[PDB]
């Protein structure tokens, strides 16, 4: 994971927003969307900012928040933080992660500045390393922080099971109706979607997930 001073921002475009793969998390609270309905409530594009911050700074990654890292390192979608004690707390001491301590001006939201220069006033280094250690506490334990940005990427379309020989209310890829589905001996050409009768009535359909031709008979009347 990149440092909080220079986070890794990954944009999402043309994606199937299935959040069930991700959802023990230290903290998980997203604003502007339903936590349990992330698939239905989608946006145009999503940007994921990945950074490593200490546990004591986990509360600073929020909209309207303040802190040493909130106002100078990462200013704020979703705020996902997870424990990384066994992953980032090196026995010899991990100093790969660096955090900014002083800045000329307050950082704009969703804005990051990467620099390695030393400020001259008498020399001060704006970026300081976070010394995560296995003997550190919960607040000083490393935690992987992912920040999502909310702005064409929606959840997968839901599907039900297939029922045959029973009067069902089917919906095959937008072809809706009511009837009794059964195995049909008709041989569709491999580019066709459904069939029609001499009176322009539907007589068959191809299952979008099984590629089988299902005869359709109306429910008895």
């Amino acid at each position: 994971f990149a440092s909080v001073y220079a986070w890794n921002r990954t944009r999402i475009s043309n994606c199937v927003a299935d959040y069930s793969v991700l959802y023990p998390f230290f903290a998980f609270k997203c604003y502007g969307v339903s936590p349990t309905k992330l698939n239905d409530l989608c946006f145009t594009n999503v940007y994921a900012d990945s950074f490593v911050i200490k546990g004591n700074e986990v509360s600073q990654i929020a909209p309207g928040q303040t802190g040493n890292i909130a106002d100078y390192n990462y200013k704020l979608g979703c705020v996902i933080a997870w424990n990384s004690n066994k992953l980032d707390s090196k026995h010899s001491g991990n100093y790969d992660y660096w955090y900014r301590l002083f800045r000329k001006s307050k950082l704009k939201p969703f804005e990051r500045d990467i620099s390695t220069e030393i400020y001259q006033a008498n020399c001060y280094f704006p970026l300081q390393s976070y010394g995560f250690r296995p003997t550190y506490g919960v607040g000083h334990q490393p935690y992987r922080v992912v920040v999502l940005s909310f702005e064409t990427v929606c959840g997968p379309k839901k599907s039900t099971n297939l029922v045959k020989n029973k009067c069902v209310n089917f919906n095959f890829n937008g072809l809706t109706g009511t009837g009794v589905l059964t195995k049909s001996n008709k041989k569709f050409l491999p580019f066709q979607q459904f069939g029609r009768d001499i009176v322009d009535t539907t007589d068959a359909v191809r299952d979008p997930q099984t590629l089988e031709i299902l005869d359709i008979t109306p429910c008895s009347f």
Partner: antibody
Amino acid sequence: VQLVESGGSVVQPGRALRLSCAASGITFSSFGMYWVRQAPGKGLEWLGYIAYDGSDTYYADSVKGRFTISRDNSKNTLYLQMNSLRIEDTAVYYCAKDYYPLLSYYYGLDVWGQGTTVTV
Amino acid sequence: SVLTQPRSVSGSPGQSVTISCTGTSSDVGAYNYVSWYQQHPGKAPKFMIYDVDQRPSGVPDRFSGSKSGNTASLIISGLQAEDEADYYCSSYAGSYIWVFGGGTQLTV
């Protein structure tokens, strides 16, 4: 960067008194400034702070609307304009320099002045 | 909004004493920006401990401390006769405003 604070004097209550502290060198514009007061027989009380650029000004609620802190970027000097000073507003005023340069506000005071005593 | 601290803390050379200041969750229990300073009579306070568990350059390592919940404590080990001074703590009250404790006297 040594800080020399002067201007302390005895005045009648309700008068306006300005406390000015002078920095050493030309590093005053390179770091922030803060004001702290010390009443006799009590601890230290924070009065306010000033950003390195002199634009962002913050002060405590108890000193809101009465005490004004100003700094000179060219002369490396700062001022503390206290208005409507009361009888109980008698304390030693000292200036504190931020440990980190620019705008950090996440560090203690590195350099502290001698302190100017104000009585009423 | 000044964090309350004990009026005085006993001590002796060659031993260790703990000086603590207590506030509320608004400042002490919200931000980990606890700072401690050592003040001598007739002189301005000198910063010794900052950021809960950090010390500035030139300050002896004997001055340390820890914070838990809404209570901030400063622990001095191997105190000497010259270390007797009035210690005061600081915490970030938010909105770019800081507050200082009542002030605890350290004895020798």
